[PDB]
Amino acid sequence: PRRTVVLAIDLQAGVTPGCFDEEGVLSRAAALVERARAGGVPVVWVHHDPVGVGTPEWELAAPLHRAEGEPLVRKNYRDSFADTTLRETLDELGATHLVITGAQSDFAVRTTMQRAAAEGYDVTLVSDAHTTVDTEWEGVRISGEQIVAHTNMYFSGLRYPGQEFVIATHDHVAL
Amino acid sequence: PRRTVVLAIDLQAGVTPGCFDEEGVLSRAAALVERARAGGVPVVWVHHDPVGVGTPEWELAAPLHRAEGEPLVRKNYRDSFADTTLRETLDELGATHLVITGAQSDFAVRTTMQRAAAEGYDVTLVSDAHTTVDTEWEGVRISGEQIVAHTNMYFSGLRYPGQEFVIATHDHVAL
Ligand SMILES: O=C1N[C@@H]2C=C[C@H]1C2
Ligand SMILES: O=C1N[C@@H]2C=C[C@H]1C2
């Protein structure tokens, strides 16, 4: 019995500013959430507490809004499963398939989606609904755009025995 | 009781050719393995069977050589723990800390090191002893060099409760 859950990670006012394609990604994530709501697909929100619990920066970035009855999981690390209520929350919902949108592509999203895969979930990465910022290391710059693209490349070929991984845009993903 | 194990991933003749800094990375991985051997630190080799089991491409890339008594784990997926004897092998050795070198940075290395973190290991990524190739996706090119650099950036800040993650060069890593 496949049950899909939309998992929206760290889409917070203090996280998304300055990210690649910021307005576009936030708009498509919002559309995805609305599509899920209309289809009766559960949405689970994840917030990174070190952004500053109790501050406006911690709250959802516009135009995102949490609806009544939608779980919210708070975390202190990149992995949304690490020392959190996520697994318990997903088990209570009977989730088998996670549709992931959020930020940042190379940190919380990267770590959570691979953890999800390791735990045995089917996972769909929403290719046009995650983002991050430009960075540089070891004397080379890597743009947010490159990281998003490389992230989608990686996920499109990800495989685990008995598990299914799908890459799709926000308007194509099967909910 | 911290026990360090050097985990050398997919350093195969059919994998490394064309990779960024190919000769350098292979030479430093070899040096690391020799340092580990001299220090009595166990080395565990991982080979990707889909490279072509029984073919020369599957075997270790020069100048790497496996020593007597060094375990070898065979796998079919990016995650070296997925449907393999890795965990059993590491448990038998009492491993608590994994020092990771190998290829490719963005596939088998990326997936194995994050899985290792999820499983609860302390992990050290050997910053100058992993590599991959240039690629492109969504109309943007990302060089092997950029992927290696971004991989090291990611790992340097990785955190889990009660776990330690270290980034260090092959000649600096504590064995
Ligand atoms: O990807 C991410 N989301 C939170 C802010 C930075 C990391 C943690
Ligand atoms: O990183 C990697 N090592 C093997 C060849 C490609 C992936 C699997």
Nearest C-alpha in B relative to A82: B160
- Cβ–Cβ of B160/A77 closer than 8 Å? yes
Using an 8 Å Cβ cutoff, are B83 and B77 in contact? yes
- Beta bridge mates, A150: none
* Cα–Cα distance for residue pair A45/B84, rounded to 1 Å: 34
Element at B92 (helix H, strand E): helix B86-92
* Cα–Cα distance for residue pair A96/B108, rounded to 1 Å: 25
* Cα–Cα distance for residue pair A142/B146, rounded to 1 Å: 6
CB half-sphere exposure, B168, CA atoms < 13 A: 14
Query: Which among B73, B141, B75, B150 has a CA at the least distance from the CA of B105?
Result: B150
Using an 8 Å Cβ cutoff, are B144 and B25 in contact? no
Q: Count CB neighbours of B48 within 10 A.
A: 23
Q: At what angle do helices B144-156 and A144-156 cross, to 10 degrees?
A: 90
If one counts the domains in chain B, the total is 1
Instruction: Say how far residue A159 (Cα) sits from the centre of its chain.
Output: 19
* Cα–Cα distance for residue pair B57/B12, rounded to 1 Å: 7
Domain extent at residue A106: 1-175
Resolution of the experimentally solved model in angstroms: 2.0
Query: Which among B143, B26, B22 has a CA at the least distance from the CA of A138?
Result: B143
Using an 8 Å Cβ cutoff, are B70 and B42 in contact? yes
* Cα–Cα distance for residue pair B34/A118, rounded to 1 Å: 32
> In this complex, is the C-beta atom of B162 within 8 Å of any C-beta atom belonging to chain A?
no
A169: chain B residues, CB-CB within 8 Å = none
What is the dihedral angle through the alpha carbons of A64, A67, A70, A76, rounded to the nearest 10 degrees? 40
B152: chain A residues, CB-CB within 8 Å = 137-138
Q: What is the CA radius of gyration of chain A?
A: 15
Q: How far is the CA of A86 from the centre of ligand 1 (A)?
A: 16
Pocket test for ligand 1, best of A48, A51, A84, A130 (most atoms within 8 A of CB): A48
